[PDB]
Amino acid sequence: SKPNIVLIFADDAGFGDFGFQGSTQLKTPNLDKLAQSGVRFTQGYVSDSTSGPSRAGLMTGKYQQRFGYEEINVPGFMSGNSALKGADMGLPLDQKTMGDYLKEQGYKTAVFGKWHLGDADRFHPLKRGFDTFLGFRGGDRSYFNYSEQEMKNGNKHFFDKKLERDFGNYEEPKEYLTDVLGKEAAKYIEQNKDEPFFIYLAFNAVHTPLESDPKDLAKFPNLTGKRKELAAMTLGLDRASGYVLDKLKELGLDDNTIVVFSNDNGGPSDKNASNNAPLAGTKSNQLEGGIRVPFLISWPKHIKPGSTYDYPVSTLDLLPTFYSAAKGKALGSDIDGVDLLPYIQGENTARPHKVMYWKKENRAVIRDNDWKLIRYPDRPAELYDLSSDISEQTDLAAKNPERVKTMFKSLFEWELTLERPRWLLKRKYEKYDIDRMDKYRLPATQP
Amino acid sequence: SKPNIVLIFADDAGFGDFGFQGSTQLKTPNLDKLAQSGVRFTQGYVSDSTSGPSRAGLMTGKYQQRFGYEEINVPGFMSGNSALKGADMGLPLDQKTMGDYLKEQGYKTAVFGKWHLGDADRFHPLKRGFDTFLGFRGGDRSYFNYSEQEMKNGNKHFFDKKLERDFGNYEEPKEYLTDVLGKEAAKYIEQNKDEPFFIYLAFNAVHTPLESDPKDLAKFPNLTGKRKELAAMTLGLDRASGYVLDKLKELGLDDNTIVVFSNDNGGPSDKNASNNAPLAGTKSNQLEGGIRVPFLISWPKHIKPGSTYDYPVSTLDLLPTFYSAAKGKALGSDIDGVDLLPYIQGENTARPHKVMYWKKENRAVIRDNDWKLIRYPDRPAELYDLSSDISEQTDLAAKNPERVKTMFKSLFEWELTLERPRWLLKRKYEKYDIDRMDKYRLPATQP
Numbered sequence: 001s002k003p004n005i006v007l008i009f010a011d012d013a014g015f016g017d018f019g020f021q022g023s024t025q026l027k028t029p030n031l032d033k034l035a036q037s038g039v040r041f042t043q044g045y046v047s048d049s050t051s052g053p054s055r056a057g058l059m060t061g062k063y064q065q066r067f068g069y070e071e072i073n074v075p076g077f078m079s080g081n082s083a084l085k086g087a088d089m090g091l092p093l094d095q096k097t098m099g100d101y102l103k104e105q106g107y108k109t110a111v112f113g114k115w116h117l118g119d120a121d122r123f124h125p126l127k128r129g130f131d132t133f134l135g136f137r138g139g140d141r142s143y144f145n146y147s148e149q150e151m152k153n154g155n156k157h158f159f160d161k162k163l164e165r166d167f168g169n170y171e172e173p174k175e176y177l178t179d180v181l182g183k184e185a186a187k188y189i190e191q192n193k194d195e196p197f198f199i200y201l202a203f204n205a206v207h208t209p210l211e212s213d214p215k216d217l218a219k220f221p222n223l224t225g226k227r228k229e230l231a232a233m234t235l236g237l238d239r240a241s242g243y244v245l246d247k248l249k250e251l252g253l254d255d256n257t258i259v260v261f262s263n264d265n266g267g268p269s270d271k272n273a274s275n276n277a278p279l280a281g282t283k284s285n286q287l288e289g290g291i292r293v294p295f296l297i298s299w300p301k302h303i304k305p306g307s308t309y310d311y312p313v314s315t316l317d318l319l320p321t322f323y324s325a326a327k328g329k330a331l332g333s334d335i336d337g338v339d340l341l342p343y344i345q346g347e348n349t350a351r352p353h354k355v356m357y358w359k360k361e362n363r364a365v366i367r368d369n370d371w372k373l374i375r376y377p378d379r380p381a382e383l384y385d386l387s388s389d390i391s392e393q394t395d396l397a398a399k400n401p402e403r404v405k406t407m408f409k410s411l412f413e414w415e416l417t418l419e420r421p422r423w424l425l426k427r428k429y430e431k432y433d434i435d436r437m438d439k440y441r442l443p444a445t446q447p
Numbered sequence: 448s449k450p451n452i453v454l455i456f457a458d459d460a461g462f463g464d465f466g467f468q469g470s471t472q473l474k475t476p477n478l479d480k481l482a483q484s485g486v487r488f489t490q491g492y493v494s495d496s497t498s499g500p501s502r503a504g505l506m507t508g509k510y511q512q513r514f515g516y517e518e519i520n521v522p523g524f525m526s527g528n529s530a531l532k533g534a535d536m537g538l539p540l541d542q543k544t545m546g547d548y549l550k551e552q553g554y555k556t557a558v559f560g561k562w563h564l565g566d567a568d569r570f571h572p573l574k575r576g577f578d579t580f581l582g583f584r585g586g587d588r589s590y591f592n593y594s595e596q597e598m599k600n601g602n603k604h605f606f607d608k609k610l611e612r613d614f615g616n617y618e619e620p621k622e623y624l625t626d627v628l629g630k631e632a633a634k635y636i637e638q639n640k641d642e643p644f645f646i647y648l649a650f651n652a653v654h655t656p657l658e659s660d661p662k663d664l665a666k667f668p669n670l671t672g673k674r675k676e677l678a679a680m681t682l683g684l685d686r687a688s689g690y691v692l693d694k695l696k697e698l699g700l701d702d703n704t705i706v707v708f709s710n711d712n713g714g715p716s717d718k719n720a721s722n723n724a725p726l727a728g729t730k731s732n733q734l735e736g737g738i739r740v741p742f743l744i745s746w747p748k749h750i751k752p753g754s755t756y757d758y759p760v761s762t763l764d765l766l767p768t769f770y771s772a773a774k775g776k777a778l779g780s781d782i783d784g785v786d787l788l789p790y791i792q793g794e795n796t797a798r799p800h801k802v803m804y805w806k807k808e809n810r811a812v813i814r815d816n817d818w819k820l821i822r823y824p825d826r827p828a829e830l831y832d833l834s835s836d837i838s839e840q841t842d843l844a845a846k847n848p849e850r851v852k853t854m855f856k857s858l859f860e861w862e863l864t865l866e867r868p869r870w871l872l873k874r875k876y877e878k879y880d881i882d883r884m885d886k887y888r889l890p891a892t893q894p
């Protein structure tokens with residue numbers, strides 16, 4: 001029987017900022033129970049440390065740099081020299097999505113919340129294998145309704161923040177957006193309970209702006225400023241996820257539903273007070289704190305409850321995992337991900353990925369087993385043993401010069417399989433990305 | 448009195464491949480006498496190790512990466528994702544050229560031979576401060592006439608190879624192109640002998656294809672294959688330069704004429720059998736063999752004959768040097784070059800450039816005094832003391848880790864002042880550039 005698939009994909013959450021990730025300060029009871037119901041990945045990665053490229057990898061099961069989706073698509077932030085600007089930046093139309101693949105297997109498909117895979121009509125979710133959409137095309141938006149005046153006074157890219165149903169039916173949220181998105185996903189489950197369905201629940205929680213339900217803020221009297229907002233926004237993310245998980249149980253769909261929880265990129269600790277403990281770094285850098293994310297898979301009667309899987313896995317793996325579960329027999333020859341199920345169930349004791357890569361311009365990483373080489377524009381390449389140094393504080397480059405040379409050559413061989421980028425950020429953002437990395441160069445710790 | 452200015456700019460010549468550069472195999476009598484007539488620079492550099500970007504720096508007196516002219520403009524070789532392709536790649540129109548500056552000082556201005564600063568009409572020499580043109584818009588062409596049929600049946604970029612007078616008056620060369628270009632420059636001197644003139648004589652010699660006057664091939668009976676052609680093509684370059692130098696002497700203009708000889712980039716030893724002795728590397732890499740070039744300045748009664756100048760200088764310096772000689776008092780505030788005359792004459796004993804930079808994508812160089820840091824995509828950054836190690840064979844990076852870190856930060860600070868590139872080569876050419884560098888990693892030696 002073809003299982004339902006629910007992918008809950010948070011935005012800008014701290015690695016440490018869930019109960020199941022070791023938080024005692026924040027409250028995530030619903031997602032903690034999801035963790036206990038299935039397998040928790042201790043080394044789950046996104047394909048990039050920023051939103052657009054991460055989502056391009058997730059949606060395609062491919063290294064997004066292979067189709068030139070290398071730097072983040074941010075209308076108004078792009079170089080005057082960029083090949084594509086504004087609404088023309090998007091997931092190339094020749095790429096086949098997770099939605100397209102599950103549509104081939106007869107699934108009902110919906111996306112709720114953040115898209116960020118292009119603002120033009122041709123890049124719209126309903127053109128990319130999704131039946132149904134309630135969300136926003138761009139990278140961020142308010143958790144409450146925009147006034148008519150705010151929409152009138154927005155710059156030429158502001159339209160991508162407007163809450164939208166399907167193909168251009170604009171209507172602002174009537175309550176806290178996190179609750180709207182969760183309730184919509186639960187309504188869609190109810191409407192499609194008799195047929196295989198795929199939901200992509202792309203919460204904007206816990207992305208800026210720092211806005212919360214006042215009742216949620218009240219539950220954190222001992223937290224201050226940004227961290228109090230993050231706590232409240234996290235409680236909202238967890239409650240809204242709860243609407244979906246509870247609806248599945250209520251309708252008896254638990255045994256025949258795959259639920260995934262992950263996060264688009266590492267926490268931007270300076271922006272939303274996210275905490276990536278015990279990792280160094282943040283959003284937009286390639287330290288573990290930027291690329292390693294909370295990662296759960298639940299499939300009752302198929303995946304052992306309360307289990308952990310400790311070899312590296314990728315958001316790139318989700319497309320082939322979902323497609324195989326959906327009884328798909330025509331996977332494209334170009335997929336970088338692997339079906340995780342044989343690995344999760346111990347049929348395959350090998351690493352799903354011996355070698356993994358990250359790249360934004362001159363900043364790149366090659367990982368070989370637990371060896372991690374990090375290349376930078378502004379400092380010598382660093383080598384970490386992640387099996388003894390999760391926080392990347394002990395540079396072993398000088399002690400292992402032959403391994404550094406061999407990993408450098410392997411990194412460049414992979415770079416040679418990539419397209420040149422399709423769009424380029426203004427020069428100044430490389431300084432912002434590196435300066436924040438140096439601000440969070442030390443390990444984060446649970447408060 | 449405003450001096451005449453003649454800039455002879457060869458293409459793809461080997462560093463060692465002139466008598467005045469230490470060759471005992473090749474014949475360059477005319478240019479050897481030019482060297483003896485003036486100052487020879489032992490550390491003269493182009494702004495890039497390839498044609499288009501080198502010429503953009505030369506024409507502007509600016510780091511060409513500041514206006515996004517970073518990778519070479521080669522129609523048909525560009526990424527399908529490139530922002531600008533074919534005829535649209537060119538020196539940005541908001542840049543002010545060497546021609547424009549000397550036109551302001553009342554000079555007659557001419558360019559003969561290779562342009563390579565854009566194929567579209569708007570990038571044409573007669574739009575960029577040149578009165579007159581006989582040459583070709585693109586990067587290479589035959590040293591003999593193309594048939595009407597060859598020109599009709601060429602790909603969509605082939606038109607940029609056609610020999611052109613002024614604004615689209617096409618006529619193929621009636622003899623060996625090197626002789627045509629020299630004789631045209633000599634005719635222009637004759638026509639303008641009573642008025643200040645500037646000639647940019649951009650020979651395609653000694654660029655591929657390997658075609659020579661049979662009478663020149665006859666002067667090298669003991670050489671074979673590519674090296675014989677290079678020898679013959681070099682003798683032609685020297686004779687054609689001779690037409691110009693002999694015309695200046697014949698008309699008594701020697702004492703009031705600045706003559707410069709240089710070369711667009713290091714020798715592509717695999718392509719035209721050029722020899723960069725005693726340097727390592729070649730065209731398209733940032734070893735000394737790619738970026739250091741033969742560099743002569745003659746101004747009889749102003750520059751001491753038979754002298755050498757040993758501090759680093761740049762083609763970027765030629766615009767301000769020329770403009771100051773032309774009595775210009777309104778240099779732009781954006782010029783990276785300096786007027787060399789005070790340095791040559793000992794009015795300024797300081798280094799003209801304490802710091803110099805090169806950049807193509809991930810490949811970059813910072814030089815601080817005689818320290819050279821080289822960054823690569825596929826290997827650890829290398830550090831050379833050029834005052835003890837001209838051939839870049841003793842990597843000091845491990846011995847001097849703090850200097851490596853300091854120069855890395857300074858390199859990135861300069862990168863932050865640049866635009867993103869305006870066009871991007873196909874990915875595969877980075878493999879070709881690096882593999883050839885490794886083929887010529889050892890010092891070249893005089894045959």
Ligand SMILES: O=S(=O)(O)O[C@@H]1[C@H](O[C@H]2O[C@@H]3CO[C@@H]([C@H]3O[C@@H]3O[C@H](CO)[C@H](OS(=O)(=O)O)[C@H](O[C@H]4O[C@@H]5CO[C@@H]([C@H]5O)[C@H]4OS(=O)(=O)O)[C@H]3O)[C@H]2OS(=O)(=O)O)[C@@H](O)[C@H](O)O[C@@H]1CO
Nearest residue numbers: 050051072073074076139140150268271283284429432433
């Ligand atoms: O006048 S404005 O007050 O500032 O009006 C406000 C709203 O506009 C703003 O909206 C947010 C906040 O500031 C600007 C915009 O932020 C930018 O949003 C981008 C969305 O794509 C992007 O965020 S991201 O998607 O999460 O990556 C930008 O962040 C990136 O910038 C670089 C590229 O990658 C990283 C950086 O290197 C990434 O940084 S990060 O990792 O830290 O996130 C982010 O800066 C502003 O938008 S604007 O269009 O520029 O004006 C306006 O819409 C609203 O109506 O009013 C408010 C004021 O009340």
Ligand SMILES: O=S(=O)(O)O[C@@H]1[C@H](O[C@H]2O[C@@H]3CO[C@@H]([C@H]3O[C@@H]3O[C@H](CO)[C@H](OS(=O)(=O)O)[C@H](O[C@H]4O[C@@H]5CO[C@@H]([C@H]5O)[C@H]4OS(=O)(=O)O)[C@H]3O)[C@H]2OS(=O)(=O)O)[C@@H](O)[C@H](O)O[C@@H]1CO
Nearest residue numbers: 497498519520521523524586587715718730731876879880
């Ligand atoms: O069958 S052919 O021999 O190909 O036909 C010939 C003519 O077409 C060719 O002409 C030459 C030979 O092959 C192509 C062309 O070479 C390319 O010319 C470019 C000019 O811009 C460029 O040279 S460059 O300007 O000096 O840089 C290309 O070299 C570069 O390529 C990459 C970019 O930088 C470097 C590389 O990474 C640089 O390499 S290098 O440093 O070694 O110089 C060079 O490959 C081909 O032209 S075509 O546009 O591809 O078709 C044809 O017109 C004529 O009619 O027939 C001849 C054969 O008789």
Ligand SMILES: [Ca+2]
Nearest residue numbers: 011012051264
């Ligand atoms: Ca995000």
Ligand SMILES: [Ca+2]
Nearest residue numbers: 458459498711
């Ligand atoms: Ca050249």
Ligand SMILES: [Cl-]
Nearest residue numbers: 011012050051
């Ligand atoms: Cl984001």
Ligand SMILES: [Cl-]
Nearest residue numbers: 458459498654
């Ligand atoms: Cl060239």
